Amino acid sequence: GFDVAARLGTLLTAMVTPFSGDGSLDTATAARLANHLVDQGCDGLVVSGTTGESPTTTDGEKIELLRAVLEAVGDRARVIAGAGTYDTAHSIRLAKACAAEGAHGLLVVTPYYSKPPQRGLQAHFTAVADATELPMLLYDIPGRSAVPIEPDTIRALASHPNIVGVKDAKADLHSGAQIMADTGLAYYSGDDALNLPWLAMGATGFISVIAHLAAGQLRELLSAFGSGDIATARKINIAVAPLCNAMSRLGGVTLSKAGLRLQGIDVGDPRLPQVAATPEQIDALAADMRAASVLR
Amino acid sequence: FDVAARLGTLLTAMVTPFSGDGSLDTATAARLANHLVDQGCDGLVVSGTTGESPTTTDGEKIELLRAVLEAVGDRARVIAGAGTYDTAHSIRLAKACAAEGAHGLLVVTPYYSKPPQRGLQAHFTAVADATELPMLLYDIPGRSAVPIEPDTIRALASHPNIVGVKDAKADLHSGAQIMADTGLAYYSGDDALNLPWLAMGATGFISVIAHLAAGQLRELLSAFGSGDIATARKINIAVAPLCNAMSRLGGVTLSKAGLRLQGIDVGDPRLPQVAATPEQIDALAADMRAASVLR
Amino acid sequence: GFDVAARLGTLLTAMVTPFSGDGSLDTATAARLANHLVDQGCDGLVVSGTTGESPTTTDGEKIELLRAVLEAVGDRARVIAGAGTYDTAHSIRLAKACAAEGAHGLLVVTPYYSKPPQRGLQAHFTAVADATELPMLLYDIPGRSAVPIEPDTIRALASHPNIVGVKDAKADLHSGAQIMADTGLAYYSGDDALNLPWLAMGATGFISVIAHLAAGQLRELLSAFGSGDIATARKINIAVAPLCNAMSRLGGVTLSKAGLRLQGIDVGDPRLPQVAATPEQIDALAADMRAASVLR
Amino acid sequence: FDVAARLGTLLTAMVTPFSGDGSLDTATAARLANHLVDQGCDGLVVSGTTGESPTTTDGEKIELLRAVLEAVGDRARVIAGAGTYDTAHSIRLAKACAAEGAHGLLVVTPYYSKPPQRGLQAHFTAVADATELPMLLYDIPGRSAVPIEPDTIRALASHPNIVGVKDAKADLHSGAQIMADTGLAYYSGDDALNLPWLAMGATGFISVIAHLAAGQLRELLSAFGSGDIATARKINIAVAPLCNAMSRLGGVTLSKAGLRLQGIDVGDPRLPQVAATPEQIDALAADMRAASVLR
Ligand SMILES: [Cl-]
Ligand SMILES: [Cl-]
Ligand SMILES: [Cl-]
Ligand SMILES: [Cl-]
Ligand SMILES: [Mg+2]
Ligand SMILES: [Mg+2]
Ligand SMILES: [Mg+2]
Ligand SMILES: [Mg+2]
């Protein structure tokens, strides 16, 4: 019908934006990363989201990235472009620009920082949803944006034809479960810590940060859960848990770029105010990656 | 030690029925305990928070425990709530429960006074040391104002009597790892997270909504454990309105009002807990009809 | 007609309950401490509050301590008895028993742990207020009790003739300022960190933990503020800040008992689940005490 | 460096007026700036959060700054908001503000992206290095999702250009000590805490309700400064309803609706911010009457 799993994917990486030594956009590496992540078992990628350092890249860079990633993997994976900011006008421009590039879908985070009221969020999300014909995910992350999309807002927004699901970092699994049951909105785990809980509650899949490093295992986790092998699912979730722990220490940006580098896929360093892992951080990260069998 | 056999898989955090005058009603407690077991609970927690442990005396708790043991103790596991924010008292209580023949203990993190982790460890250890009963830690920082930090849980794990955790902290990721590392059994201590906890390998539920929907929770546990997650998810959705009602009322007000709606009068809460208002009963009745446990 | 400052005091210690070596109630030491604290500048004391280890003492012990304290200082200081638990009927017995002993007022904390609704709190505080003729203070401390006394509940309760004030640890200075203006409820700073901001907002004084160690400076701080010398008040508040920092590390019970010992006033150790300071914690506290000029 | 003289004692976190079509309205900005200075503000912050920094372009912010400098720069201190969650952008914006002749910078903690403390420090250092302007840190974790931790503020205090903090974090105890240790100036960034901040030695207010009640906030600062705390307390009570309306509406909706109610139309917010509904206007009007800033 709208087949969210087919149209958006089941395992997506909230993909980093590789930068060169010169700190500029590195689209060739983005292509290589995108290919690698899909080969490792991702069937979708979110480009220019939070972990893609959307705050510090320009509109132009976001479009160049999306173009490169679509060229690299667009015929065999779903490419979802991060398109929202705390500026409704800007989000609509970016959304239209992403659609014009051929993005397969949009991920639109709750306007952050400015704490609009729920009716402002709701007018914001529908305006963005009205801007293109692309399927759109809400990204509910009050821990970064400083306001939740309240359940009544999510429910009101669900009736928008273009708004098809929720990337959740709010962790209200009880509320999201009901929302799903009532509205048919698809949910993606937006927090690797809750990947397995979310699947139990009927999430469609993951939009994952630790997928940068452990996509193969996450794919296996999805396959095991999917075939009702919960014991295995649980065991894989435990196996990757050190990466999620490392993520708590470093955040996704620092972790993803340092961890990829450790795996021999240099994707450069974060842009200020984000920072590259320190020596000791790289150390501790390497031990977790070893523990999760994603580094020798 | 078989946690599922010894403690159960579906337990109600059972109310303590009071008479019209406010006094302990053990006859109704027996009748309730029988009902809850017949509906599908294989264990009960008596004199926990939902059992209004704050407002009942030691004597009342013991009276109730004996009544419930006598009623269902041959056919279900009866775990007694035994800790407060007072180690000496908790010890006394745990001992009094063991002397009555309680099958296990549920020991909440000391509330209010916010001891440091080493105080918590010394406290749980002292309680664990006081009887030979299996003991669950009850981690509910939202009530107690301090968590049992994962290191503290792990240190406690190696106490022979400390066999698991009733979790209301919702740190599913951390609980999962603790389980994997220590073999501590986890019980969902918050109905909202029943299904997520099962996914993470919880042993079962120590439930409030079980007062009203034990049969469905049992079906949820069986569907889940048989490998039928889609049916488990459906059942979870079916009972959600009860968890919603619980967010509005709290477990004590909900459980007493809902049982009354079901025709099992268990009296009213003791101050500072309060009986549902007429409006609340009506809204509660709507959720209960929605959950197919009334009318 | 009720003069809160005269009836309840301006500088109170949330006084520890001294225990002997065997853990038993030490009333002779309580009497010595009560005298010391009054001599140092407190004009009132709260007995059997949280810092007095109300969770771990019996009713009998509370009554015995109250008597010892009234006897020691009740002729020249106000003696306020902690009477609230999460059990209304118990709080009533306690309140009555304290009234019968001659307590000058009651401090009644929000029922903890069980999270009654606001109407439950209202019925609870009312029932306790109805139990005796004593003036009564609400102790709003959601950080321990797990529920606030909401402003509407406080306002409702202000309408009781026996409820005369609030010991605040909620830090809603804006709300408390308005409550005071609207209701004439007196406020006492219940968290030493906010003593000075609370005075700015019209608090009557402090019900203090660090007063165990620094009553004289707190007295000076009240006097400086009262005479409008805010610069001096701010200076003193800075001088005693290390004690407030130590309190963050140790909690009040541990800090008060270890600190008094350091000062040559041994008041024994806390009862489990509270714990005595470790030698390291004692060293760190001594450094803070010296900085605050309340230890050689 | 005289912070009071160089940055002011009473500043409004000023709205950015938009025309009917949503476009920047610099004439009304100039109008508004003159009005606020005349009412008692001795500085203004332009293109802060209340100034809708999220929804205005760089060009608009510069145009507005230029107009506000022309309007009141000779008689008031005009502080330009210059921080975002992008360090290179913040640097551009700071430079651009300095080139316009801004008297100082207000730089908010990078929001949303939750950089670590060392990222914050490198960020605020890079922005502080970018111009010769005095700079205020704006610590508001309730919006930015990370605090500037005390150690970070203390490390930053040593930067010659970093001269103070606009606080919305409400850690009065910590700011008090930071002030004592570093000489950093503090401004109350949350009207609720204006009076408590003065007690702790804040230099003044960077205020939202100053849009409506600058004159009373001025009377407050003066009463406090001369040692008449009783009067300061009374004034703070008198304007409290404005702070309460702010809790209902947020500063942007409140400021633009309230100014309109006063007869200074500054248009409507840009999405995702929203204009007050009719009921909200009524309820706001009632508070403004209570605060004697509306007939
Ligand atoms: Cl939700
Ligand atoms: Cl944990
Ligand atoms: Cl309040
Ligand atoms: Cl701070
Ligand atoms: Mg839809
Ligand atoms: Mg064990
Ligand atoms: Mg009164
Ligand atoms: Mg400096």
Side-chain angles (χ1 to χ4, degrees):
Chain A
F2 193 80
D3 192 338
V4 185
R7 290 280 301 265
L8 301 186
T10 57
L11 174 57
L12 299 85
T13 304
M15 199 183 87
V16 290
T17 300
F19 300 131
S20 301
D22 71 7
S24 73
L25 185 65
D26 183 355
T27 53
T29 294
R32 188 208 163 204
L33 182 54
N35 274 305
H36 164 80
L37 293 170
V38 175
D39 289 348
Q40 290 300 295
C42 295
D43 57 0
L45 298 165
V46 174
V47 295
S48 315
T50 317
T51 308
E53 290 175 77
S54 54
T56 51
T57 57
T58 65
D59 290 350
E61 282 168 334
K62 287 181 182 62
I63 294 309
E64 300 177 283
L65 177 71
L66 174 62
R67 180 180 330 241
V69 167
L70 279 167
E71 173 63 14
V73 297
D75 301 328
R76 62 181 182 121
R78 305 312 286 163
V79 182
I80 304 335
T85 69
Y86 53 9
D87 177 341
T88 303
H90 182 196
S91 299
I92 297 171
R93 295 199 287 280
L94 189 54
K96 290 186 181 289
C98 292
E101 281 316 300
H104 298 134
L106 304 173
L107 176 72
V108 183
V109 69
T110 303
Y112 32 85
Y113 173 70
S114 72
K115 301 176 71 170
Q118 296 294 309
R119 70 197 177 89
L121 295 180
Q122 190 170 326
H124 168 91
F125 285 121
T126 48
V128 182
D130 283 337
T132 78
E133 287 295 282
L134 294 187
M136 168 170 159
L137 296 173
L138 311 172
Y139 186 10
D140 193 8
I141 182 158
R144 290 183 179 285
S145 284
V147 289
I149 316 172
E150 300 275 34
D152 279 356
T153 310
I154 298 180
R155 291 163 180 277
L157 283 171
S159 74
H160 199 292
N162 294 331
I163 303 184
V164 298
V166 177
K167 177 189 178 186
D168 175 82
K170 186 167 62 196
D172 194 339
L173 288 135
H174 176 76
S175 182
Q178 292 173 90
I179 292 174
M180 281 196 264
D182 280 342
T183 67
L185 283 176
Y187 269 56
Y188 286 87
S189 174
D191 175 355
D192 282 299
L194 296 186
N195 287 348
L196 181 52
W198 266 124
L199 286 188
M201 299 298 248
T204 295
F206 313 149
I207 297 166
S208 172
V209 172
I210 80 176
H212 277 106
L213 309 182
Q217 284 181 88
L218 292 185
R219 172 49 71 193
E220 291 164 358
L221 196 172
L222 290 149
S223 300
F225 185 90
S227 61
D229 184 359
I230 322 291
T232 291
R234 205 134 56 202
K235 175 187 175 54
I236 302 151
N237 183 75
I238 287 309
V240 301
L243 306 180
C244 175
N245 299 346
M247 209 192 315
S248 297
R249 298 195 307 269
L250 300 183
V253 171
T254 295
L255 169 131
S256 302
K257 296 194 154 178
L260 285 165
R261 176 170 278 155
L262 277 165
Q263 292 184 325
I265 305 150
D266 199 298
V267 293
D269 276 349
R271 281 174 184 184
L272 282 176
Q274 307 301 320
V275 289
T278 63
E280 189 50 36
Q281 280 170 343
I282 290 171
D283 248 39
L285 178 52
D288 285 319
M289 297 174 72
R290 285 191 178 92
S293 309
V294 304
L295 188 64
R296 304 227 166 257
Chain B
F1 169 100
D2 191 338
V3 189
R6 289 281 301 263
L7 299 185
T9 55
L10 178 55
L11 301 86
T12 304
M14 191 184 93
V15 288
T16 302
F18 299 133
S19 308
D21 68 359
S23 65
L24 180 64
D25 189 355
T26 52
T28 298
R31 178 183 173 208
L32 184 56
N34 275 316
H35 164 78
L36 287 175
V37 174
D38 288 348
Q39 289 301 289
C41 301
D42 53 1
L44 294 170
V45 171
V46 296
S47 309
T49 319
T50 305
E52 293 172 82
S53 62
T55 50
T56 60
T57 65
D58 284 356
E60 288 175 328
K61 290 180 174 62
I62 289 303
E63 216 149 24
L64 165 95
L65 165 69
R66 195 217 266 218
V68 166
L69 283 159
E70 166 81 307
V72 298
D74 287 341
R75 79 193 197 268
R77 315 303 293 171
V78 186
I79 287 33
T84 57
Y85 53 10
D86 179 343
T87 305
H89 186 191
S90 287
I91 293 175
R92 280 202 296 280
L93 217 23
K95 284 197 200 273
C97 296
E100 284 313 301
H103 295 135
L105 299 178
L106 178 64
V107 184
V108 75
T109 306
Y111 32 83
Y112 174 70
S113 64
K114 303 178 72 170
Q117 292 299 304
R118 66 197 180 94
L120 291 185
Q121 195 170 317
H123 168 84
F124 285 120
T125 299
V127 177
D129 277 348
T131 81
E132 294 319 306
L133 297 190
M135 171 173 155
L136 300 171
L137 311 176
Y138 181 14
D139 195 3
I140 182 153
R143 293 187 179 280
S144 294
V146 295
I148 316 170
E149 296 281 23
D151 283 353
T152 302
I153 297 177
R154 292 164 184 273
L156 289 168
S158 67
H159 199 288
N161 300 330
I162 299 184
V163 299
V165 175
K166 176 184 172 188
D167 176 77
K169 183 169 69 192
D171 199 339
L172 290 140
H173 179 72
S174 183
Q177 282 167 101
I178 294 169
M179 277 191 261
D181 285 338
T182 63
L184 282 180
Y186 270 57
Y187 283 84
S188 176
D190 172 354
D191 289 300
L193 297 182
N194 288 344
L195 179 49
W197 268 122
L198 291 186
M200 299 296 247
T203 297
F205 312 152
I206 297 167
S207 170
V208 174
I209 78 181
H211 280 99
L212 306 182
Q216 278 177 94
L217 291 189
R218 168 61 60 200
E219 290 173 311
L220 191 170
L221 290 159
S222 308
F224 192 93
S226 76
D228 182 2
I229 312 303
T231 290
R233 197 155 42 223
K234 190 180 85 184
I235 298 154
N236 189 67
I237 286 309
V239 300
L242 302 177
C243 171
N244 297 349
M246 199 187 321
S247 296
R248 301 196 306 275
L249 305 175
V252 169
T253 297
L254 172 126
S255 303
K256 294 204 159 177
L259 282 162
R260 181 171 285 148
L261 278 161
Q262 291 184 330
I264 302 151
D265 200 306
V266 297
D268 282 350
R270 280 177 182 176
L271 285 176
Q273 307 303 319
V274 284
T277 63
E279 273 202 317
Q280 286 171 335
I281 289 151
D282 281 350
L284 175 60
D287 288 325
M288 289 185 304
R289 296 179 237 109
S292 302
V293 306
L294 179 68
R295 268 101 148 111
Chain C
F2 191 85
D3 192 340
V4 186
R7 292 276 305 264
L8 299 191
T10 55
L11 180 57
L12 299 87
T13 307
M15 197 188 80
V16 288
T17 301
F19 298 129
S20 305
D22 80 335
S24 71
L25 184 64
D26 187 358
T27 52
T29 298
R32 167 198 189 203
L33 176 69
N35 275 302
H36 166 75
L37 290 176
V38 175
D39 288 355
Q40 287 303 288
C42 298
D43 53 2
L45 298 167
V46 176
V47 298
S48 309
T50 319
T51 303
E53 293 170 80
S54 60
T56 52
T57 55
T58 61
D59 290 351
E61 283 175 334
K62 293 184 174 63
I63 293 309
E64 201 173 349
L65 167 73
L66 177 57
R67 306 181 50 184
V69 175
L70 282 157
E71 168 69 33
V73 299
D75 270 14
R76 74 193 204 276
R78 320 299 288 177
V79 182
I80 309 335
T85 63
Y86 52 6
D87 179 340
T88 304
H90 185 199
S91 294
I92 293 167
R93 291 189 303 272
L94 221 38
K96 282 168 169 252
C98 295
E101 282 314 312
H104 296 134
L106 302 170
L107 175 69
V108 184
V109 67
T110 308
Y112 35 84
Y113 173 68
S114 69
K115 303 181 73 169
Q118 290 300 303
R119 68 199 181 87
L121 298 185
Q122 193 183 350
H124 168 83
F125 284 121
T126 301
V128 179
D130 286 342
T132 78
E133 317 306 322
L134 292 188
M136 171 164 148
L137 294 174
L138 308 175
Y139 188 10
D140 195 4
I141 183 153
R144 295 185 179 278
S145 288
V147 292
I149 318 179
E150 299 286 20
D152 282 348
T153 302
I154 297 174
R155 292 166 178 271
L157 287 167
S159 74
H160 199 292
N162 299 335
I163 302 182
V164 300
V166 176
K167 179 183 175 185
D168 177 74
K170 181 166 78 195
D172 193 339
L173 286 146
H174 180 69
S175 181
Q178 286 169 101
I179 289 168
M180 283 191 268
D182 286 344
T183 70
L185 287 175
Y187 270 56
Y188 286 88
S189 182
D191 164 354
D192 283 298
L194 298 178
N195 289 340
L196 182 52
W198 268 124
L199 290 184
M201 297 302 245
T204 301
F206 312 150
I207 297 174
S208 170
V209 174
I210 75 179
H212 282 102
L213 310 179
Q217 283 172 96
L218 294 185
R219 172 54 63 183
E220 285 175 304
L221 191 184
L222 287 155
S223 302
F225 189 89
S227 77
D229 189 357
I230 318 307
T232 295
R234 218 136 55 199
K235 186 155 97 156
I236 299 162
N237 184 70
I238 286 307
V240 295
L243 308 176
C244 176
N245 300 344
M247 199 187 328
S248 296
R249 302 196 305 272
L250 299 181
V253 166
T254 293
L255 169 124
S256 293
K257 294 204 158 175
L260 280 166
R261 187 170 273 150
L262 282 163
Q263 288 185 331
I265 305 153
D266 195 309
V267 293
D269 282 346
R271 285 173 182 181
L272 285 173
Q274 307 305 316
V275 288
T278 60
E280 144 150 290
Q281 290 179 312
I282 291 170
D283 289 341
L285 170 66
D288 282 333
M289 283 192 253
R290 287 186 292 267
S293 281
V294 302
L295 188 64
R296 230 205 156 274
Chain D
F1 187 85
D2 190 341
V3 190
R6 287 282 301 265
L7 302 184
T9 56
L10 178 57
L11 297 88
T12 301
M14 194 185 87
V15 284
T16 299
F18 303 128
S19 299
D21 67 10
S23 69
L24 183 59
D25 183 0
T26 55
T28 298
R31 197 172 282 215
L32 173 58
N34 271 309
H35 167 72
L36 298 171
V37 178
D38 289 347
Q39 286 303 292
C41 298
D42 57 356
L44 297 164
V45 174
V46 297
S47 310
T49 323
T50 307
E52 293 172 82
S53 56
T55 57
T56 60
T57 66
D58 289 346
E60 288 173 332
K61 294 184 170 60
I62 291 305
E63 275 181 280
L64 166 85
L65 175 62
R66 176 178 305 125
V68 172
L69 284 171
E70 163 78 335
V72 302
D74 296 310
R75 81 194 163 108
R77 310 305 289 176
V78 176
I79 308 329
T84 61
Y85 55 5
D86 176 342
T87 300
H89 181 208
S90 298
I91 291 177
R92 292 199 293 279
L93 205 50
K95 291 190 192 286
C97 291
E100 278 317 296
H103 296 135
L105 296 175
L106 179 71
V107 186
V108 76
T109 306
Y111 35 83
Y112 176 67
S113 65
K114 298 176 81 169
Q117 293 299 305
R118 63 197 181 90
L120 292 180
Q121 194 182 323
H123 168 88
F124 283 120
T125 308
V127 180
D129 277 349
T131 81
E132 286 307 299
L133 294 189
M135 167 176 159
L136 293 173
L137 311 172
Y138 184 13
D139 192 4
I140 185 156
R143 294 189 176 278
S144 293
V146 292
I148 320 177
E149 298 281 26
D151 288 345
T152 308
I153 299 177
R154 294 169 179 270
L156 284 170
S158 79
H159 198 288
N161 305 326
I162 305 181
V163 303
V165 175
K166 180 189 175 181
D167 180 74
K169 178 167 72 196
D171 197 335
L172 291 273
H173 175 72
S174 182
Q177 287 167 99
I178 292 173
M179 281 196 265
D181 282 342
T182 69
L184 282 180
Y186 271 56
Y187 287 85
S188 179
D190 173 350
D191 282 298
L193 296 178
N194 285 346
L195 181 44
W197 269 118
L198 290 186
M200 301 299 249
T203 293
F205 313 147
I206 297 169
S207 166
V208 174
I209 73 182
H211 280 101
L212 307 184
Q216 283 178 86
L217 294 188
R218 170 60 61 192
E219 292 157 29
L220 202 165
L221 286 163
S222 299
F224 196 87
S226 58
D228 186 2
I229 326 291
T231 296
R233 203 144 60 218
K234 287 164 175 77
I235 295 161
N236 182 67
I237 290 309
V239 299
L242 301 180
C243 172
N244 301 342
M246 204 188 325
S247 292
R248 302 194 308 271
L249 301 181
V252 167
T253 295
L254 172 131
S255 296
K256 294 200 157 177
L259 284 161
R260 183 170 279 148
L261 283 162
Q262 294 182 332
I264 303 151
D265 193 309
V266 297
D268 285 339
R270 285 176 182 176
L271 279 173
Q273 310 299 320
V274 294
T277 63
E279 304 204 341
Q280 281 178 330
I281 291 164
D282 284 350
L284 170 56
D287 283 326
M288 296 171 62
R289 283 193 190 95
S292 302
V293 297
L294 184 74
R295 75 169 273 118

